[PDB]
């Protein structure tokens, strides 16, 4: 299939070839694949999915023009199916899917492509599947670190991706929240996305939420609106402080004091902040004489007097 569609190309001053054209084929594929994205039809859809997935991973490194606009429409379906971890029990359709996502994400995009791919990423992110949201975050992570300069040249892209990362930072599910925080830490670390007063006040507001402190003794099976907001706020602060592992900026001490405030907050906020602080402590220890000078004495003693150890300690 790759060798079939290779002759069709987007090279400059190329006439439309008479050879087979990839968009019509992807259109046929998507049209047959709509039900997956009857019971018997579902299985045929899965088999077709397997074949086209193999085609995608084959055409990842070969095609002259990667990421044809039609084939991006398959990414929602590839996203929801793909697993959130690496394991052999998954029956290997999901393993192939994960490989395909990683490979396609490690691919150049034209400037005209990135608004389209970001629109797709926004569409799948509002999808229900928490697996899907985790996958879009990590795909976004690597797909941004590659062609970061394209994304950087496009300001609307930076705006949309910022909005999406912060939006998913507040999602109900803890895994996607922590993943969003990690993506944010990376985006900040590379400086593709830069924190400022808006991010800081947004996270401070979300953290500054009073917990209900009540429950129904006599009788949702879902978490709640308060604690998720608290968690997202502290997650924002954690992504910020982890943005700079080997150096401390001027705002980091204040952020650290604000984290130390929530150390006794109820779970999951406690586990999150403890992990972030432990990571800060291990990373910044190398040049702590240089780092401490930025800090005040009260900040320093407060940070020294922190119980961030894991459960197995004690």
């Amino acid at each position: 299939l790759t060798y079939i569609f290779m002759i069709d190309v987007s090279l400059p001053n190329t006439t439309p070839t008479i050879s087979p054209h990839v968009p019509e084929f992807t259109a046929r594929i998507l049209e047959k694949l709509k039900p997956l994205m009857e019971e018997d039809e579902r299985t045929q859809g899965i088999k077709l999915l397997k074949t086209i997935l193999k085609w995608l991973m084959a055409s990842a490194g070969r095609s002259f023009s990667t990421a044809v606009t039609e084939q991006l429409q398959l990414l929602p379906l590839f996203f929801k199916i793909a697993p959130v971890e690496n394991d052999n029990s998954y029956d290997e359709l999901k393993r192939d899917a994960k490989l395909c996502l990683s490979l396609m994400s490690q691919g150049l995009l034209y400037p005209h492509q990135v608004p389209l791919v970001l629109q797709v990423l926004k569409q799948t992110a509002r999808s229900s599947s928490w697996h899907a949201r985790y996958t879009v975050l990590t795909y976004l992570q690597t797909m941004v670190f590659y062609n970061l300069f394209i994304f950087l040249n496009n300001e609307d892209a930076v705006k949309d991706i910022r909005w999406l990362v912060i939006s998913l930072l507040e999602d109900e599910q803890l895994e996607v929240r922590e993943m969003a925080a990690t993506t944010l830490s990376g985006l900040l670390q590379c400086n593709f996305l830069t924190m400022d007063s808006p991010m800081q006040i947004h996270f401070e507001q979300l953290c500054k939420t009073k917990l209900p402190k009540k429950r129904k003794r006599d009788p949702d099976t879902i978490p709640s609106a308060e604690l998720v907001k608290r968690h997202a706020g502290v997650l924002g602060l954690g992504a910020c402080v982890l943005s700079s592992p080997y150096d401390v900026p001027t705002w980091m001490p204040q952020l650290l004091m604000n984290l130390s405030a929530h150390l006794n907050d109820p779970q999951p906020i406690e586990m999150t902040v403890k992990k972030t602080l432990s990571n800060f402590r291990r990373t910044h220890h190398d040049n702590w004489q240089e780092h401490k000078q930025q800090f005040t004495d009260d900040q320093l003693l407060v940070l020294t007097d922190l119980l961030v150890s894991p459960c197995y300690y004690a």
């Binding site: 150390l263 006794n264 109820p266 779970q267 190398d286 040049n287 007097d305 922190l306 119980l307 961030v308 150890s309 459960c311 197995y312 300690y313 004690a314």
Partner: protein, 240 residues
């Protein structure tokens, strides 16, 4: 950037005449939850702040019975702790078996010192990264013994270990004169207030997170968990 050649292993002396690994392991006990030990003339207590991974989680067992007349409160690594507890329990049992006698606390801490010191000098065996408060009553009287991964041990009127032990140390050294003539309930109250000194303002001592271990001349070492600690807790005045 500032990688240090000489902290790789415990057997390595630095040019500054220090064992960085031992110092670091002594740094580890502070990772644990705070615990307070103090004594009157005829009583000795161990007051600990147990903590949980989750609300559903029940709580970790900081206080332990080595014997009828000896108890401990662990800080640092619980594995190293359980090893030490088994060793000490066996030693006390051996002493009762052989001599029909309770083991002296000074003797027990000395044995712990030897056992802990051994890894420090051997390659490939990391130090016991645990700090203990050893409390018991013997013929001499009540005792409070601190031990560290360094294998040094001390005798104290009172001591606190773990995270934020320093504030409790300050209160304790302020009121150490009072503790000696104190009755049992007052001594427990002092320990509770000292443990409160370490707590953040948001946190407050509760039945669940507090564990009291107490020994006396006519009283075996006991542990009070949640309800058993409530009478001692209720009397304590509100924090400033």
């Amino acid at each position: 950037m500032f990688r240090n050649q000489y902290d790789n292993d415990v057997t390595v002396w630095s040019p500054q005449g220090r064992i960085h690994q031992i110092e670091y392991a002594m740094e580890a006990v502070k990772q644990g939850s705070a615990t307070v030990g103090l004594k009157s003339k005829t009583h000795a207590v161990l007051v600990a702040l147990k903590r949980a991974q989750s609300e559903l989680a029940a709580h970790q067992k900081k206080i332990l019975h080595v014997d009828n007349h000896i108890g401990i409160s662990i800080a640092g690594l619980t594995a190293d702790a359980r090893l030490l507890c088994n060793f000490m329990r066996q030693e006390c049992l051996d002493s009762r078996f052989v001599f029909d006698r309770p083991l002296p606390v000074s003797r027990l801490v000395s044995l712990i010192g030897s056992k802990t010191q051994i890894p420090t000098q051997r390659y490939g065996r990391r130090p016991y990264g645990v700090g203990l408060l050893i409390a018991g009553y013997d013929d001499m009287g009540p005792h409070i013994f601190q031990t560290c991964p360094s294998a040094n041990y001390f005798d104290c009127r009172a001591m606190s270990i773990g995270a934020r032990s320093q504030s409790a140390r300050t209160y304790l050294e302020r009121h150490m004169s009072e503790f000696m003539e104190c009755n049992l309930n007052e001594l427990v109250k002092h320990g509770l207030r000292a443990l409160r000194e370490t707590l953040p303002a948001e946190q407050d001592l509760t039945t669940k997170n507090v564990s009291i271990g107490i020994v006396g001349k006519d009283l075996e070492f006991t542990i009070y968990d949640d309800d058993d600690v409530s009478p001692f807790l209720e009397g304590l005045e509100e924090r400033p």
